[model samples]
Target: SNPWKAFMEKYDLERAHNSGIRIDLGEDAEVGNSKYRIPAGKCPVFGKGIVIENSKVSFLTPVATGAQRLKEGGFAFPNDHISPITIANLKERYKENADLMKLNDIALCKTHAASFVIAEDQNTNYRHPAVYDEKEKTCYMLYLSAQENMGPRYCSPDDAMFCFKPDKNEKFDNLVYLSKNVRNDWENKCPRKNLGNAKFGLWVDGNCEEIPYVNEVEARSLRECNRIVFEASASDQPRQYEEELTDYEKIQEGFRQNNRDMIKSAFLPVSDNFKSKGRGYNWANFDSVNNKCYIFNTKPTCLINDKNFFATTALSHPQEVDNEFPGLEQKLISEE
Candidate 1:
């Protein structure tokens, strides 16, 4: 009665025979399942093929999982490409500041906010934030590859990060000015071209070369490029979208739902200690309540409420604050 099923059955039968295998139809064969078996010689061939295929598939799974782990684990974008060994070394170097470094996951969000500040401040010659390599004397431009996710919001470094060499033609004194001009005019504007959807590089010269959009291949290449530079760090002031408070509120609501789903998904996979406490709070919401509000959000909220709570909070190191809020702090409450 199902013509499609009949057709597939016939096709599979033909395929099995061509491959020196027999399609066995058991007494209770289902529509899709034929009690299929490989003929003597065919078994060895097909078995070998399956082994190769599966091995190839399994190889990429770990890489994807590793990337996802870093993302969810709260490492900054682009920097995660430095390899586990490198990150471990970095952790050891900053051992005295372990708490701050451990908050690396939170740092990515702060990096985004800081990036906005750098973009909005006309006084600074720095365009986006500069990811500087102190050892190599190279600089990089950090941009968001995609919209951030809810919890441990993972952004793609391939899309969001870019490496820049100082404009060789410019005089040393004028280099900073040149970099800033290029960043504001081209790098910032370029991301908007792909519908604010895709990530790519914007070369910081007058030429303004557009690099490939973020992809597996491109990410690999970018990683290679940055590896040549030593000790890269981001240098953008966090920007807040004060005008888009309503939009961010909407995002916060959606992030609440998304974070709840993430907690549900992680319940079984993680240890009991790591399991979420079933708190109703959204982890990604940057409202003052989350204690994650940065300069950008704080400045605007201060304008409306005439309170300097955000400024005061900013003075206290963000790494020292407890991210989990059992009791809502009224000053941090979202109007939403």
Candidate 2:
């Protein structure tokens, strides 16, 4: 028997939904018709593409795929965290694939690449790329919270984007040094300062038309990508995660609280002894994939791959899952 079916029968979730009693199964759960138990005192963070392999539950985690393939498939990583291939790394790694090896040619990216931006600087602050404009002979670069950290770590200001043209043949390797150059224009442009080091890749051959625009829209995307809700560590309190949430996220949290309250209020009509506590009922889920009960709202002891894919230990041993990932890769390709 499907354990989830048993869970549904026991909880009468259908009646609950029909009766206008709502449980906040996250959007992933709703979309996938999936349910996984969150740990006690932890809130549910449902995984996308839930599947069971080898008697264990797993999630369809994303891997670093090429941009062209991603765009054509209409797919992307869930959190907006993109691990961009650097110019040096891209050349060395894709030497065998002639098509991929061409990305090293800056001329190709400038003339042919869709977005003139070369990278999403995952190693550093997750900043986008800097482009040297051919028309103006200037480099327009973007900044983040600071020189070494991603935007989420510090305050990102409105005037983060600066346009500067190099006057001298500079010896610096990092892009942030370009900020030290003059901005505004050739005659009126003035020297800027304290712009952090650039860990992001730069495209030297791009024209003005192809440059990336860094506005609130992009900042919001960066924030969303950096946001992570991993399992709380041993010493960490559950609510401690709330501190990292943005004002926008706090607004979302308010809605989640309302849903929780509604569920508790609905149960009040059941019996005199059924007191409505604001926290509501403890909801756990049975994983038909793993044949175990998920402790509703807890983080899984997950394993991470070189490709940045993740899977929980509840599924298998860490060392054993190299075989597991190939299956995931096939599934991703098929779905894509």
Candidate 3:
């Protein structure tokens, strides 16, 4: 049995991926979700194939895969979190093939062959090369907040996406320094950081799918790739490695925001609630292979990515499933 599931009932904290309603811990207004401050013995953050291996069930580890074959598949780490029945089903896929293939296990991903971006040689001697194509440079930025109006992130006047500093020298993939924001909220014990160092593999890539509606005109097929719901540590707080930030001090940093040029780039929208929470405003640049999300603007533009191609915001952009989004509804905002 999944002990993790049982633990949720016992702990009684908010668990849904999109569940952000308050648990009411009698804490201050600013304390936020810190209401559900009960220390839980067990919490099971989900895992998967299309899913990230990131887990809350500490007991499980990656299962060693079967030998490589023509048909490859992800291995199951038989455990409570993973149903026995589900395991059997996944096992069937590899019954004849052993499907021990780990993500990024392809030999081509590890080939000693001369791999170039468009690479080099032909027409443009600067077709670039694989791994890190300088020409096809990809930029990254981050936003952090503890407010209640929107989700964890949003596009505000003072809010801007600061470009990320990256370190490409990795044993396997690239590593990038993103953001580090410390929370003064009671849930995370008031002085903890909700940020972490991010790498390339932490990403799932896709383009928006376009569909039609009678009045709405167009619909967007936005698939969410990843999301996380962090929990407060137990009654006895634990820190493997901790750093102190000179004790509740504030530093006067300039503007502290940047121009959202990356808004036109592939990025994720960081909101502040459970409503449009988990599905980060992951979007891309205008008509480019990559894109991003948004909110509040003098020149509000709606963009779309259909079949890996992008569409510029056509004046009054159409809105449909976007109704599922936090607040922008057809009645309030005209669905272009």
Candidate 4:
């Protein structure tokens, strides 16, 4: 029996609220990668196309065609499919389309009609979807997945924030990537290294200032800055620097470790209904009435028991611990 149907037949809002019984909207109500169901209707009430304004958020219905690949500047919406697709399925259907698979910066456009291409990383082999805002004519995307290893599409930060402003031809003409301000210092030192990966939230503020485009000269600066000579197993006093030292610098200074700024703030413990470690559709929605953001992912089951929850603790001492464990005092310390 449909709980939603039963409750509404003789609805009593106050009594229903008092009973503490949740009306399961059934599988039809649940959307995203878990169900692989795209939000439908003129104005979809739940899931995907998340938009925030006046400190509140809502979802939008799509206006474009369905999901398809864009090659040489052209693609068409499919006629038979209604759901978002997987990279594996796309490959099986196309039968190892080498040209499609090997392209480093390929665009998987219109995974959802209103949305455009998902993240360019094919390593994780998951579908990344975005929502399109018709009024603004911009696409907003959030990428949080395991794309490990250093390659052309390898992302150091696990999460990403993307804003795509398509041109008149409806192509990804202008794309601006934003990083959460968690590691502003590291970002300043190495721009676009991780690009957009933050634990808490995506930074959506830009004052319409013209960000200067990177040139050949800027590339040389980054190349030279990354080159440093190293010597291992040598015993010598280390050099000190004026600014807060990076992780590598701390190792060189012969300090077993300093306060680990690089390592400490990498995980997103819990945010609303979103768990960091899970197989989510990367689909999100906002409950305006309740003033909450709902990040949708699959629940743990026998086959997928590790779908949610991973915890970490703050066990290390503060930066003051650095002063206490000097190299000279190593002889006196004991591990209990």
What is the lDDT of every predicted structure here? Answer: 0.20, 0.20, 0.18, 0.19
Sorting all predicted structures by TM-score, with the top scorer first, yields: 4, 3, 2, 1
lDDT of 1 by residue, 68-162 (tens): 32112211123333221233344554567745464342232222223333233234212122222222333333221111122212212312211
What TM value does model 4 have? 0.17
TM-score of 2: 0.15
Residue 197 accuracy (lDDT) in model 2: 13
> Where does candidate 4 stray beyond 4 Å?
1-79, 104-106, 109-336
Clashes of each: 13, 11, 23, 0
Residue-level lDDT tens digits of model 4 in 1-336: 221232121112112111100110111111122221111111111111112112111212211122211111111112234322443444454455665454211122122333333253232222223332322334333232111112222112331211111111112112211111111222122112110111111112321111122111111211121110001101011111011222223222221232122111111111112211112111112222233222322211111011121100011000101111112212456697
Please give each candidate's TM-score: 0.14, 0.15, 0.17, 0.17
Candidate 2 residue 295 Cα shift, in angstroms, is: 63
- Residues 1-336 of candidate 3 have per-residue lDDT tens digits of 221232122122222222211111111111121121110111111111111112221111222123321012111122223221222333343355532332111111111111222222232211100121112222111111111111122212331221111111112122111111111121221111111111001111332223221111122321111111111111111212112321111111111122112111111121122132112221111211333311111111222213433221111011112211111212355678
TM-score of 3: 0.17
Q: Which residue pairs show collisions in model 4? A: none
Compose the digit string of candidate 2's lDDT tens values, residues 1-336. 121232122122112211111112111111012222111111111111111112121111221123311112111122222222234443454478766454323322221212323243222211222322222232222211111111222223331111111111111111211111112121111111100111111123331111132111111211121111111111111211122433323322322343322211110111212211112211222222233322222221111122322222111111112223222112234554
Error of 3 at 2 (Å): 38
Single out the weakest 10-residue window by summed lDDT for candidate 3.
194-203
Error of 2 at 70 (Å): 27
